[PDB]
Amino acid sequence: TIDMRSAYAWSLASTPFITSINDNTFNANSNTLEYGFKRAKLSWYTID
């Protein structure tokens, strides 16, 4: 196994595609601020 649940090893991700490279679901093809209009909040951590 390769452990992938380290908290500090994950960072904020880019806008993804949901079906294919031609899928404009989360406005991933947008070249403006609309590229980030579908980003909801996400906190990734490990409770101290």
Partner 1 sequence: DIERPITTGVPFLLVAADARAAGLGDQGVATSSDVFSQQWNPAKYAFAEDAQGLSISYTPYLTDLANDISLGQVTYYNKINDRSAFAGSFRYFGFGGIELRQTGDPNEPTREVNPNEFALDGSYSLKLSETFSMAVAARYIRSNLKVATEEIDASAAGSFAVDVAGFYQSEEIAYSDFNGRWRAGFNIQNLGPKISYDHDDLSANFLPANLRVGGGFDFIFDDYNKLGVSLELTKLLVPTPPGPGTPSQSQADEANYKKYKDIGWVSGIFKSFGDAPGGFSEELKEITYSAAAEYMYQDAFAMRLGYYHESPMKGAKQFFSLGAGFKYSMIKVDVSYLFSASKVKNPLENTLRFSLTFNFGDKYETY
Partner 2 sequence: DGLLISVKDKTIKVTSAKENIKEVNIFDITGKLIYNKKKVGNTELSISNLQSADQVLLVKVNLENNAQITRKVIFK
Partner 3 sequence: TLPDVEDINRDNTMSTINAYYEYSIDVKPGMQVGENYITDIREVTNVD
Contacts with partner 3 by CB under 8 A lie at: 11, 17-18, 21
Under rule CB under 8 A, residue 4 binds partner 1: no
> Do residues 22 and 30 make contact, with C-beta atoms less than 8 angstroms apart?
no
Q: Which of 5, 7, 9, 45 binds partner 2 (CB under 8 A)?
A: 9
Spell out the residues 6+ positions from residue 23 whose beta carbon is closer than 8 angstroms to its own: 17
Under rule CB under 8 A, residue 31 binds partner 2: no
Q: How many CB atoms lie within 10 A of CB 28?
A: 16
Which of partner 3, partner 1, partner 2, none does residue 1 bind (CB under 5 to 8 Å by kind)?
Answer: partner 2
